[PDB]
Structure 1
Amino acid sequence: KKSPLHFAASYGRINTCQRLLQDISDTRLLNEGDLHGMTPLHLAAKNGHDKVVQLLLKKGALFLSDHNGWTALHHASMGGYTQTMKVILDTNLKCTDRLDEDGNTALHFAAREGHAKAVALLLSHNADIVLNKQQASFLHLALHNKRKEVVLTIIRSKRWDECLKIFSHNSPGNK
């Protein structure tokens, strides 16, 4: 019954997820894995269904990690969905500054894919700006992809001076 829950959470079927999650006894089916190691929390956050991920948090789910170290907030910021992002941020705050296997945070992905409101949402909260495995900040990773709107909304922010301070003198790429 794991594959119907993965299909119903991967496409925003809220009533099918309510009918599958009536038995509140066994939570081993709720936090189960995938072939690529994704919980239904990860699938519901990847496609950007806020009510499904709110239901899975209300029933009780654990912020596990992908095989590549991603989180639900990493998928929601890779997609640029502000609603699931806002729900995950309103539940907990200890999941924001979280690293993947490559050292990227969620703000790195939200700036790499060029989502302005996602960057503004993680930036209005405390984002804990850190470098990459290749010593790249999120501002570097936005400038190399020529994303005009996200670097403009970094400039319009209040954290801009702080965003200017951090880089690597030794790194030949992010000069």
Structure 2
Amino acid sequence: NESPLHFAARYGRYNTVRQLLDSEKGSFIINESDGAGMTPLHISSQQGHTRVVQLLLNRGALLHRDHTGRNPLQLAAMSGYTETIELLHSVHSHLLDQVDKDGNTALHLATMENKPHAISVLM
């Protein structure tokens, strides 16, 4: 199966995330990818959990990229979660204008999956 932090980060589950990052293991588990390449910062924002992705940024998570080369802005833009890209832009304003392995930005990924309410916020 998957890690206890990768389980807690994608299903909301706030007090379990705060407790796993409180342990002695909770220093190198925060930046660990899975077989798809996603850190807990990727899966928390792909699923649109906006107060779990904030605690991962107060503890200083690194902005790595998965096997497709996407940052947490582009994964949340594919899913149309508007409140979690207004928070990631307020603390990292340089993830908006980035590309991936296929060269697509966040406006490219929000139109491939028909997310009209994000396009008005991405622009």
TM-score between the two structures when normalised by the length of structure 1: 0.66
- Post-superposition offset of 1:65: 0.2
Separation in 1 of the partners of 2:7 and 2:102? 29
Q: Is the 8 A contact 2:80 2:110 kept in 1?
A: yes
Structure 1: which 5+ residue stretches go unaligned?
Answer: 124-175
Paired position in structure 1 for 2:89: 89
Paired position in structure 1 for 2:71: 71
The one-letter code matched in structure 2 to 1:120 is S
The one-letter code matched in structure 1 to 2:121 is L
The one-letter code matched in structure 2 to 1:55 is L
Separation in 2 of the partners of 1:27 and 1:63? 15
Tell which has more relative contact order, 1 or 2 (C-alpha 8 A, sep 6+): 2
Separation in 1 of the partners of 2:49 and 2:25? 25
Q: Secondary structure at the match of 1:90?
A: helix
After superposing the two structures, state which structure 1 stretch, 74-83 or 20-29, moved more.
20-29
Separation in 2 of the partners of 1:50 and 1:60? 16
List 4+ stretches of structure 1 deviating above 3 A. 23-26
Asked if residue 120 in structure 1 is aligned to residue 103 in structure 2, the reply is no
TM-score between the two structures when normalised by the length of structure 2: 0.92
Separation in 1 of the partners of 2:58 and 2:88? 11
Determine which structure has the larger helix proportion and give its number: 1
Output one character per residue of 1:35-93: Cα deviation in whole Å (capped at 9) or x when no partner. Answer: 11100000101111001101101111111101110111111001000011111111111
**Which one has the largest radius of gyration?**
1
Separation in 2 of the partners of 1:121 and 1:68? 24
Asked if residue 42 in structure 1 is aligned to residue 42 in structure 2, the reply is yes
Q: Aligned-residue CA RMSD in angstroms?
A: 1.5
